[PDB]
Amino acid sequence: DYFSLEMTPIIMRPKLYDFDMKRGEPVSLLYILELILFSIMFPNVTQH
Amino acid sequence: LRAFASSFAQRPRAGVTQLKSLLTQLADPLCLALDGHVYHLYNVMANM
Amino acid sequence: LRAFASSFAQRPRAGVTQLKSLLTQLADPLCLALDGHVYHLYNVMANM
């Protein structure tokens, strides 16, 4: 589904889940890693 | 952690700062309530 | 590991970097598939 979304012409600003990202504790940085990796995977999606 | 450094031995010299992040994380969901609700409470009570 | 160094005590300050090598090692058998197969997939799908 995602890979197909890659080239499907986007006509609706996608969103991403509301999620209890924890500040402070050195786990948040893993959450930064998550979406930076995701962006490496899918430039066409993140661009929006 | 600086004035008594020679009282913890690598453990819980990480735990002592481990709980500080806990205190921090817990402060927010309260400070929000305070500074977003109690503010107007006082701004009224200070006029009766 | 640098911005929070005072949160791990010799363990798992070796484990935190222990899993980084795991992530690295796992990245390859996927990036190969990606950059050797999905490439032509997109190079086609971008023309229909």
By secondary-structure content and strand pairing, the structural class of chain A works out as mainly alpha
Q: Please tell me how large the radius of gyration of chain A is.
A: 13 Å
Instruction: Give the ordered list of helices and strands of chain A.
Output: HHH
Span of the ends, CA to CA of chain A: 18 Å
Q: Shape of chain A, please? A: elongated
Q: What is the oligomer described by this structure?
A: part of a larger assembly
Largest interface: B-C, 10 and 5 residues
What percent strand of chain A?
under 5%
Beta strand count of chain A: 0
Q: Count of DSSP helices of chain A?
A: 3
Helix percent of chain A reads 40-55%
Sheet of most strands of chain A: none
What features would you describe in this structure?
It is classed as virus. Keywords: capsid, virion, Reoviridae, T=2, virus. This is part of a larger assembly, with three copies of chain A (48 residues). In chain A, 50% of the residues lie in helices and 0% in strands. Chain A has 48 residues and is mainly alpha-helical.
Brief descriptors of the model:
part of a larger assembly; Major capsid protein (chains B, C); virus; capsid; elongated; 3 chains; virion; mainly alpha; 50% helix; 48 residues
Task: Give a summary of the structure in a few sentences.
It is classed as virus. The structure is cut from a larger assembly and holds three copies of chain A (48 residues). The first copy, chain A, has 48 residues and is mainly α.
